[PDB]
Ligand binder design. Structure first.
Ligand SMILES: Cc1cn([C@H]2CC[C@@H](COP(=O)(O)OP(=O)(O)OP(=O)(O)O)O2)c(=O)[nH]c1=O
Ligand SMILES: [Mg+2]
Length: 330
DNA sequence: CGGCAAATACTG
DNA sequence: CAGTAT
DNA sequence: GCCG
């Protein structure tokens, strides 16, 4: 399935252009449609060669096929030459951290057209300014090698003040990709408690040696802190700034946090959607049953948290065959 | 046609 | 609450 | 966008 080579790269390459286009424009679902088809093509055991062949792949309809036939026969899609040249800018703006569809739309509607304009005439949030300062660096993905060296840093720094702590790099890393956009580290402790309030001793230790360089999201006042979104950079010459993502969780939620943080996103939403049909609910906390809702139908009480010691148990209960991380791209 | 790829955590 | 982010 |  997934872990195979894209036999239809030339096809998806272009469709991918539309997907992103419709996305920034706000057409969420239409873009979602393409996304699905694209993934379908990617995982196809062989390369598509005919119009009919495309129509046989679930997720591909006439319209989509019509575009496939054009590319397979002319090597070029016409729809691409007719995209508001306003999209490039939007795509450019939304690529800023903390900047999304709305924000990117706002700036454009205000005259801005280049990162130079925004870099001097736009109203930026502490987050956005950081995303802009490291714009070029956040565009590049890192080698599984570098990613690994980052996890180790966070881990050794954690086990530095408690060897019991367990650190695991999830996300694209755990799915075994060759490159990672960022490093998603999950931290917990077997004694189901030694994890409580440790961000301070961790974040400080990182800042101390200079590892961490920026902070995007981190409520360091409260002790109920859960996630951390910042920027780091390993020692040495020619080092780029990488996006870090760390979360601390109770050893009693490990199985559900690992599933979540491992993703992928599409995979999560999909799986979570399924649970919703079995009268359950999935999250990084646990897999529960239907919540208590009074006459009105208002959630008045939590559902019964089912026992999920490992990931496998989550699937079993959901009535699905366990899928390796690598096979969870979508 | 309308639903579809969710549940949750931070920031003004 | 709206927007952005996992 | 595709699908029930
Ligand atoms: C954005 C997002 C993410 N997730 C989960 C599931 C994956 C992890 C890691 O996220 P990331 O985007 O780094 O993904 P990753 O797969 O690591 O890819 P990169 O290499 O970082 O791009 O977070 C989710 O459930 N819903 C979302 O909307
Ligand atoms: Mg990641």
């Amino acid at each position: 399935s997934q872990k195979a080579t894209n036999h239809n790269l030339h096809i998806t390459e272009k469709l991918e252009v539309l997907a992103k286009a419709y996305s920034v424009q706000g057409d969420k679902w239409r873009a979602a449609g393409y996304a699905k088809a694209i993934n379908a093509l990617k995982s196809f055991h062989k390369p598509v060669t005919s119009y009919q062949e495309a129509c046989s792949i679930p997720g591909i309809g006439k319209r989509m096929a019509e575009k496939i036939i054009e590319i397979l026969e002319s090597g070029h899609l016409r729809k691409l030459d007719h995209i508001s040249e306003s999209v490039p800018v939007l795509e450019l703006f939304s690529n800023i951290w903390g900047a999304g569809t709305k924000t990117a739309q706002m700036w454009y509607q205000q005259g801005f057209r280049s990162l130079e304009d925004i870099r001097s005439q736009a109203s930026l949030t502490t987050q956005q300014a950081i995303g802009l300062k490291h714009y070029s660096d956040f565009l590049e993905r890192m080698p599984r090698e570098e990613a690994t060296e980052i996890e180790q840093t966070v881990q050794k720094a954690a086990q530095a003040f408690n060897s019991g702590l367990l650190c695991v790099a999830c996300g694209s890393y755990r799915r075994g990709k060759a490159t990672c956009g960022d490093v998603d580290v999950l931290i917990t402790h077997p004694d189901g408690r030694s994890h409580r309030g440790i961000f301070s001793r961790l974040l400080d230790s990182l800042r101390q040696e200079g590892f961490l360089t920026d902070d995007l999201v981190s409520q360091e006042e409260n002790g109920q802190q859960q996630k951390y979104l910042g920027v780091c950079r390993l020692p040495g010459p020619g080092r780029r700034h990488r996006r870090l993502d760390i979360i601390v969780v109770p050893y009693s939620e490990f199985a559900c946090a690992l599933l979540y943080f491992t993703g992928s996103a599409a995979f999560n939403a999909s799986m979570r959607a399924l649970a919703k049909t079995k009268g359950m609910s999935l999250s990084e906390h646990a897999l529960s049953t239907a919540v208590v809702r009074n006459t009105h139908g208002a959630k008045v009480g939590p559902g019964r948290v089912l026992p999920t010691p490992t990931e496998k148990d989550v699937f079993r209960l959901l009535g699905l065959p366990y899928r390796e991380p690598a096979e969870r791209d979508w």
